[PDB]
Amino acid sequence: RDRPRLPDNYTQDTWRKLHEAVRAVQSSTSIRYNLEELYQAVENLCSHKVSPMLYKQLRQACEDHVQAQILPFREDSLDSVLFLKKINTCWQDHCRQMIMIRSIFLFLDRTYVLQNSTLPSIWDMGLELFRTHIISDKMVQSKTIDGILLLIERERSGEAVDRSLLRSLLGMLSDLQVYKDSFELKFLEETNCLYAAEGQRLM
Amino acid sequence: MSYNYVVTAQKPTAVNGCVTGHFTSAEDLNLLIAKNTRLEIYVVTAEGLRPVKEVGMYGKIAVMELFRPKGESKDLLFILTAKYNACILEYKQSGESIDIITRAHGNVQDRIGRPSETGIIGIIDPECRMIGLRLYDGLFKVIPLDRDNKELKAFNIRLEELHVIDVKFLYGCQAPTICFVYQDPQGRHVKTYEVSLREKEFNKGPWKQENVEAEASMVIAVPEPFGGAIIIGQESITYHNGDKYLAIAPPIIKQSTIVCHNRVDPNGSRYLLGDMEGRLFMLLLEKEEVTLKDLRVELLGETSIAECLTYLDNGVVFVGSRLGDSQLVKLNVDSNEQGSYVVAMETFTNLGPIVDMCVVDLERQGQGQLVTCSGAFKEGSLRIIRNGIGIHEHASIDLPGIKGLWPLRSDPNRETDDTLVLSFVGQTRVLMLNGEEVEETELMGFVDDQQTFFCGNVAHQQLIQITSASVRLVSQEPKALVSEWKEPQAKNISVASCNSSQVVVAVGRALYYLQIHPQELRQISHTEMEHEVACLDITPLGDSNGLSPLCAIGLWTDISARILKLPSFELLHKEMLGGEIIPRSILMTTFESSHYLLCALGDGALFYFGLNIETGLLSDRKKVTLGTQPTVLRTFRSLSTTNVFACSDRPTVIYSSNHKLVFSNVNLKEVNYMCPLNSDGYPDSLALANNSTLTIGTIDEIQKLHIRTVPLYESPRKICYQEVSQCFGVLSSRIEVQGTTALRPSASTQALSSSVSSSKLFSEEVEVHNLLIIDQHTFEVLHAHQFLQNEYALSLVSCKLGKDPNTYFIVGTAMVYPEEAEPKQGRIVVFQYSDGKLQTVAEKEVKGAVYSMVEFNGKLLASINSTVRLYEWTTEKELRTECNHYNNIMALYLKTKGDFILVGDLMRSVLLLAYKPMEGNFEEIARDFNPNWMSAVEILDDDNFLGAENAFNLFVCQKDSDEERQHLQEVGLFHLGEFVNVFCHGSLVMPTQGSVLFGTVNGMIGLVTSLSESWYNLLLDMQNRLNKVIKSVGKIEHSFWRSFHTERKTEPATGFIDGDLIESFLDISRPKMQEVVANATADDLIKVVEELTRIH
């Protein structure tokens, strides 16, 4: 009764589909699956002992996409009007593609990542990649802090700049620990000196 | 008088003692396991352990040792109870019937005596000439066996040494010779005495007293070839046979103390040694031709923290743990490439020391669900307990990676589905399932080359199979396909759906409607949606014509379980859900009333709706979280109605009881897919697949508690549920050695985020304390806030204070320095968990340990060392004192009900305090002046106060009815035999009033509830009858066992009914019942006791 099947094609078409789906959702390259076929593919052609090297596969692919994001952000411009918009837009792009790969790799979560706490999440791996390669460890960090000190300080003298830009930037800061490790300090110290000048002036 | 009913919801799980031997037969190898009051007998099979008998002792089994008197065929069992009931038990199996006959029994409690520090020791002479019991300081009780007693008449020999650590009978001695380590001011020494049963006194031992290591705590009697003894201390292992003195100091045993041992061989060439860290050592005796040459210690590996360990055979070692799960490990000859030879075969659930617990209505049902801080240092964990359904695993076949299950009636005549279909990756494999037999035989018309999203029986006497490529409508009787439809672009179907009459299958972002006609497949409707299909359901329900009217859809990027009118594919409703996760299953069914829709997201959230047949508009949106894995929903029709099943990490049956939706648990590990099956050999059965095999079974009404385990790898101390935040706050404690280093990655060190206390207030191995915020769905550590250096978090409450709306985690701590015996410093820290972070909202330096905090009418009621003071939450968000109370030795436990505060003291035992708001100060209303050392306290009623003394007793105090009105009256007394750590109102279920759960050190979960006077009288009467009928194992009297017991008091039980004994009224045959029910009829009492069992 019931002679066994062959799993051979199942395993080897898989990796290529992984990295093209990565290649699809990153850069917003279009998909011929409507993503549900891909989700089912994740669900079927991932099993016991498949998932960890699969994680390696996907995280190196997305990792090199993240490090491809680097190069327009290692720069010498000093807009905080525009450079921080570029950062924010890259932030949004990153956000939508990491949420959407989770819309594909939620099987991975509800099998090994949500169902075993051994790894950074897709959230967490994505944030660490984005931070490490775009936000942290760069001139951008100092430049974005300086620029947002400009924006708020300009917005501390009258004018409104962009409530959305300040909100989104502060979101990036706090989630990447960049508003709770050491960059609260530039905010507070500029506040100290500026508001001291304000108070003893109009006093 | 109080009327209370105590019962065991979960029997004790902590293994306090285990022995091996030939108890059930001369050829059987038994593992006898003592869990506090339960004796569990197994047979050591070649694989695992086969339970044979589990008996309930009327006593805490303090000693448990197997011995074989001369001429006896098989081992007799000696048990000594904590109340000093001694008995010798023999196992007599008469065919099906199993008995434990008492070959002898007695009570060896001396009227007076200082119970020895190290605790009740019971040894048996290796030749079974006597049972030596060290119960009290300075005395050594001897129970002769050669004088064959039935009453166990025992005599004391005065032992000139008053602090005896451990004692053993030596081997190969013509006289019973004991060897014991005792502590005198000059150090620790090992001494031997010969026991004369004729002279009833000691004699000079074979080898004189010897001055041994300072921390010698273990004596190992070594069998005859070597003789002598092996004394284990902290830094050395030394061997004494009288002239030989081997001594080693293996550096590997210096890190932790060795607490249990077991002789692997019969000749004592190998011993296991378990330490308090969970390491397992092998102590080897190298013989020389026989004397003993040298000692070796080698580290085998790690296990659970062993209280007792026994070597069974073939490398199988039972590690019986009180602190963690007991284990059945294997000892490999070769190392595991990690240096360890220990390999866990099996794990036995142990709700370890339950130090705190809470009842949360998690999953938003009407069912309570315990979450307990179980276990200890390395074995700490959260256990989630709930009442769950179970079935039988009749038909199993191990096919990896099932992805499909459907019932097919291959015999066209019968309406039973005698054929089962399964899709795995890209093909379909069928099962004849003929009778109870299961083998794969092929039915024509279905393809072995394509995946199958669906197949099943359809109308016109036809079968249907929907594949990854195209649909196939087979005519059952005549032959294979005469109707096929396929996508015009030949795109693989990405999402499907089907019923007995019509078909609805999605092709990417567009959808196709087909309907069945006999030997034909007709397409009618089509639509082009915004985004890809996620899931469908078209099931006809209350159909009454032949075709469903409605459909539901989930879409990608616009996450919404929307509704469609079937003939037109048009939008009836579009309801968003949120999140980035595509819904993976959607279903509509009827639960007794109307069409509901059940849509779930990939993380176990699940929304139930009231669906109309005309508008089909979605309203009554409400959510329930079930599991973490993506889900799937398939119905089975029971006798009564449709009973929907959810398949994930936590399989859950879904159903409605009394028009109320219930979310029951199933007690199986995992289920990928399900399908009903009602074969000739299988009626109304289920067909449940996992990653490995296809499990098959039915549904059982009886409920077995389901225990989840969340390993914390560090000692949890407290736990409270913050509902508004969807989390548990857990006080954890981990041991660091060196500045400091964690000995292992604990749950605190592995949190998503973390923080450390930076406080301006206060300026070997240590305990670090953290506040763990744990997700109440995934039970992942969302956050871990470490507390100050040398700061012990003791108490923890979740509440909102004053008038502000934020719900706070409030931790009361103490500063612990070795230079002092009672902390002088501590603080109350207020945390708020929001946005995944734990901000410190307030602090308050108090001058003592904050042992307990209860939120008390908008105010914080803390108990600093001996003072109970009330704090108020000011508009500035800081704590400001309102009143104090000082008449306490140590306010250890606080409870609240209205304006009244019950204070459990370290040794003054209870105090009823009232906050008179009109004045703004406390008033001592009543007090219990008996010296009971509390372990926990609770408030049952306005005037009934449950208490637990550290002598394993329950008492209920009652405000009486002048200055004698300030005397609480102890109207309830009961010896539980368990150490209660926690009480809590709640029940694990959907005659009795109230319900108080309690968790104990042994792992018992019990239930106290109030009875009425009439039922209490009736149940007390039946209790006496059952005592007159039921016979206990060691012929112990139930009244004696439940009698309140303390070293300076002993009274009979009263106001408490042993619900265990009453519920035992069902497990006796009808003639015995009639013996019980001599003076209403029996069936009345069977109804009564059933209704009583309904509470847990």
CA pair distance B675, B682, nearest whole angstrom? 13
E strand or H helix at B771, and its extent?
strand B766-775
Contact predicate B900/B925, CB 8 Å: yes
The span from the CA of B926 to the CA of B902, in Å, is 10
Q: Please indicate, yes or no, whether residues B318 and B445 belong to a single structural domain of this protein.
A: no
Tokens at B740, concatenated = 């400091």
Examine the domain organization and report whether B353 and B411 are in the same domain.
Answer: no
CA distance B1076 to B317: 44
Amino acid at B304: S
Q: What DSSP state is assigned to residue A132?
A: I
Shared domain for B524 and B443, answered yes or no, is yes
Which chain B residue shows the shortest CA-CA distance from A47? B401
Residue B172 zone, left/alpha/beta (φ > 0; ψ -120 to 50; rest): left
As given in the structure block, the two tokens for residue B526 are 């089509």
Residues 6+ apart with CB under 8 A from A106: A39, B581, B582, B584, B602, B603, B630
Amino acid at position B217, single letter: S
Cα separation of B448 and B427, whole Å? 5
Distance CA B414, CA B417 (A): 8
Nearest to B777 by CA among B607, B625, B582: B625
Q: What is the CATH number of the domain that holds B446?
A: 2.130.10.10
Q: How large is the angle between the packed helices A122-130 and A83-104, nearest 10 degrees?
A: 160
Chain B interface residues facing chain A, Cβ-Cβ under 8 Å?
A: 399-401, 403, 424-427, 429, 431-432, 439-441, 492, 494-495, 508-509, 531-534, 556-557, 580-582, 584, 602-603, 628-630, 648-649, 691, 750, 752, 778, 780-781, 835, 837
Distance CA B1062, CA B1087 (A): 12
Q: Which residues pair with B903 in a beta bridge?
A: B894, B911
Disruptive mutation site among A31, A47, A106 for chain B (greatest number of B CBs within 10 Å) = A106
B797 forms beta bridges with B810
Query: B875: which strand partners?
Result: none
B149 SS3 class: coil
Beta bridge partners of B195: B202
**CB contact (8 A) between residue B431 and residue A2:** yes
Name every residue whose Cβ is closer than 8 Å to that of residue B155 and which is 6 or more positions away in sequence: B141, B142, B200
The whole-angstrom separation of Cα B82 and Cα B783 is 43
Instruction: For residue B583, give the chain A residue with the closest CA.
Output: A103
Alpha-carbon distance B556 to B565, whole Å? 20
C-alpha to C-alpha distances, B385 to B241, B371, B390, B535, nearest whole angstrom = 52, 6, 15, 33
Q: What distance in Å separates the CA atoms of residue B376 and residue B712, rounded to the nearest whole number? A: 10
Query: Could you give the 3-state DSSP secondary structure of residue B167?
Result: strand
d(CA B680, CA B411): 11
Alpha carbons within 13 A on the beta-carbon side of B220: 27
Let me know if B995 is exposed, middle or buried by CB neighbors in 10 A (0-12, 13-18, 19+). buried
A117 touches chain B (CB under 8 A): yes
Q: What is the DSSP letter of B281?
A: E
**Residue that is written with structure tokens 């759906």 in the block:** B497
Q: Per the structure block, which two tokens stand in for B988? A: 């694990």
The chain A residue lying nearest B468, using CA atoms, is A37
A111 touches chain B (CB under 8 A): yes
Indicate if B280 and B138 belong to the same structural domain.
yes
User: What's the rounded Cα separation, in Å, for the pair B899 and B920?
Assistant: 11
Q: Indicate if B336 and B438 belong to the same structural domain.
A: no
Among B424, B508, B649, select the one facing A34 at the smallest CB separation.
Answer: B508
Q: Give the integer Cα–Cα distance in Å for A141 and A177.
A: 12
| CB distance B301 to B340 below 8 Å | yes
Q: Which residues of B touch A11 (CB under 8 A)?
A: none
Closest residue of chain A to B559, computed from CA coordinates: A103
8 Å CB contact between B342 and B301: yes
Nearest to B556 among A36, A114, A117 (CB): A36
In angstroms, what separates the C-alpha of A77 from chain B's closest C-alpha? 34
Residues with Cβ < 8 Å from B270, sequence gap 6 or more? B263, B264, B282, B283, B284, B285
Q: Does A41 touch chain B (CB under 8 A)?
A: no
Picking from B607, B501, B595, B502, the residue whose alpha carbon sits closest to that of residue B554 is: B607
The whole-angstrom separation of Cα B162 and Cα B170 is 20
Which tokens hold the place of B716? 């949890």
- CB–CB of B391/B698 below 8 Å? yes
Q: Within this chain, do residues B19 and B162 fall inside the same structural domain, yes or no? A: yes
Give the resolution value in Å: 3.0
Residues of chain A with C-beta less than 8 angstroms from the C-beta of B534:
36
How many residue contacts between A and B have a Cβ separation below 8 Å?
A: 90
Closest residue, chain A, to B582 (C-alpha): A103
Nearest chain B Cα distance for residue A45, angstroms:
8
- Residue A163 corresponds to which tokens in the numbers above? 């409530």
- Please, which residues bridge with residue B373 across strands? B356, B382
Number of Cβ within 10 Å of residue B988's Cβ equals 23
Q: Which residues constitute the domain of residue B489?
A: 406-709
Please say whether the beta carbons of B825 and B806 come within 8 A: no
In sequence order, what DSSP letters do the residues of A31-88 get, joined into one string? -SSTTHHHHHHHHHS--TTTHHHHHHHHHHHHHHHHHHSSGGGS-----SSSHHHHHH
Identify which of A2, A35, A40 has the shortest CB distance to residue B429: A2
d(CA B809, CA B101) in angstroms, rounded, equals: 55
Strand order of the β-sheet with B229-232 is B218-221, B229-232, B237-240, B245-248
Q: Which residue, B269, B268, B260, B231, is CA-closest to B247? A: B231
Q: What is the DSSP letter of B495?
A: B
- Pairwise CA distance, residues B1088 & B1019, whole Å: 9
Strand order in the sheet with B481-486: B452-458, B462-467, B470-475, B481-486
Question: How far does B686 lie from chain A, in Å, by closest CA?
Answer: 22
Q: Do B419 and B484 have their domain in common?
A: yes
* Whether B37 and B163 share a structural domain: yes
> Which helix (DSSP H) or strand (DSSP E) does residue B121 occupy?
strand B121-124
DSSP conformation class of B560: B
In the structure encoding, which two tokens stand for residue B866, read together?
């001996």
Q: Which of B401, B429, B432 sits opposite A47 (nearest CB)?
A: B401
Same domain for B283 and B345? yes
End-to-end alpha carbon distance in chain B: 24
Do the beta carbons of residue B453 and residue B465 sit within 8 Å?
no
CB B548 within 8 A of CB B538: yes
The per-residue DSSP string of B1072-1091 comes to HHHHHT----HHHHHHHHHH
User: ∠ at Cα B435 (B431, B436), nearest 5°?
Assistant: 80
Q: Mutual orientation of helices A83-104 and A36-44 as an angle, nearest 10°?
A: 60
Query: Helix axis angle, A51-68 relative to A122-130, nearest 10°?
Result: 30
Chain A partners of B399 at a C-beta cutoff of 8 Å? Answer: 2
Q: Residues A130-137: contacts with CB within 8 Å, 24+ apart?
A: A130/A66, A130/A69, A130/A91, A130/A94, A130/A176, A131/A176, A131/A178, A133/A66, A133/A67, A133/A69, A133/A70, A134/A66, A134/A69, A134/A70, A134/A73, A134/A87, A134/A90, A135/A87, A135/A172, A135/A176, A135/A178, A136/A176, A136/A178
* Residue B1092: φ, ψ to 5°: -70, -40
Instruction: State the distance between the two ends of chain A, measured CA to CA, in whole angstroms.
Output: 95
Which residue among A7, A107, A117 sits closest to B750, beta carbon to beta carbon?
A117
Residues contacting A89, CB < 8 A, separation 6+:
none
Kindly list the distances between the CA atom of residue B386 and the CA atoms of A103, B363, B658, B1002, B1007, in Å, as whole numbers in the listed order.
32, 12, 21, 19, 14
Those residues whose C-beta lies under 8 Å from the C-beta of residue A42, and which sit 6 or more positions away, are: A104, A105, A107, A108
Q: How far is CA B625 from the centre of its chain?
A: 22
Q: Give the C-alpha distances (Å, rounded to integers) separating B915 from A168, B6, B863, B867, B921.
A: 50, 31, 14, 15, 6
Q: Per the CB < 8 Å rule, is A109 touching B429?
A: no
Site from A9, A12, A33, A34 to mutate, B interface, most B CB atoms within 10 angstroms:
A34
- Site of tokens 């040894």: B123
| Residue A184 sits at the chain B interface (C-beta within 8 Å) | no
Question: Is B22 in the same domain as B166?
Answer: yes
- The DSSP 8-state label assigned to residue A107 in this structure reads H
Amino acid at B49: L
Instruction: Supply the angle between the helices A8-25 and A83-104 in degrees, to the nearest 10.
Output: 160
**What CA–CA distance (Å, rounded) separates B587 from B537?**
5
Helices H / strands E in chain B, number of each: 5, 87
**Residue pair B725/B407 in contact by the 8 Å Cβ criterion:** no
* Pairing, β B622-625 against β B605-608: antiparallel
Measured CA angle at A69 (ends A65, A71), to 5 deg: 130
Question: Alpha-carbon Rg of chain B, whole angstroms?
Answer: 33
Residues A124, A129, A135, A136, CA torsion sign = positive
HSE toward the beta carbon, residue B561, CA cutoff 13 A:
29
A115–B649 C-beta distance less than 8 A: yes
B425·A10 Cβ contact <8 A: yes
* Residue whose pair of structure tokens reads 């049952």 in the numeric block: B940
| Domain shared by B410 and B309, yes or no | no
Q: Are residues B136 and B54 in the same domain?
A: yes
Beta-bridge partner residues of B735 = B767
Structure tokens at B499: 């019923």
Q: How many angstroms separate the CA atoms of B683 and B636, rounded?
A: 12
Question: Nearest CA to CA, how far is A161 from chain B (Å)?
Answer: 26
Report how far apart, in Å, the C-alpha atoms of B446 and of each of B430, B432, B516, B670, B983 are.
9, 14, 17, 29, 60
